[PDB]
Chains A and B, each alone.
Chain A
Amino acid sequence: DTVTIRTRKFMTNRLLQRKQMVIDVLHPGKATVPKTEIREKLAKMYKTTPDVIFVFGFRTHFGGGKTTGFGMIYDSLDYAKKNEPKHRLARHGLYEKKKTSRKQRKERKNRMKKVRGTAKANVG
């Protein structure tokens, strides 16, 4: 009844300033353990703060014993913000996407196309 965290694959990616791994999670009687717990365990295992660790794509095997996912451990938080996708940063709370929609932006652009000069900045 203790969650076990393993790392099958491992590579030091100096090009993107991170360590990439596949993560095995053993939760025989528990649900799919949250990514925050996996990040805490990986932080304890690899001796770093958990805000440089991004984990994603966790799929639980049929039967409920093991879950397999991917993880990154960046050298610093700055490199994480530089290299991570914006949606993973938003998951960690380090990024916020626009509140607009595709339809709104497209229609605004097409309306702007109909005017010339500084008047383009006066539509919405």
Chain B
Amino acid sequence: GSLARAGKVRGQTPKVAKQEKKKKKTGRAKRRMQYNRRFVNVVPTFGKKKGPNANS
């Protein structure tokens, strides 16, 4: 039961900085963006039911 290895993986993981991005809207505007993307935009869906984060 050696405690020598503790935080080894969090220690040896390469440190990648967070990229600077445009701030996201909040409140009613974020909900409006969600509603427009999911119910007003019909182009992406031809009827195959793909997930919003499908990267394949």
A contacts B: CB pair < 8 Å: no
- Enumerate chain B interface residues (CB-CB to A < 8 A): none
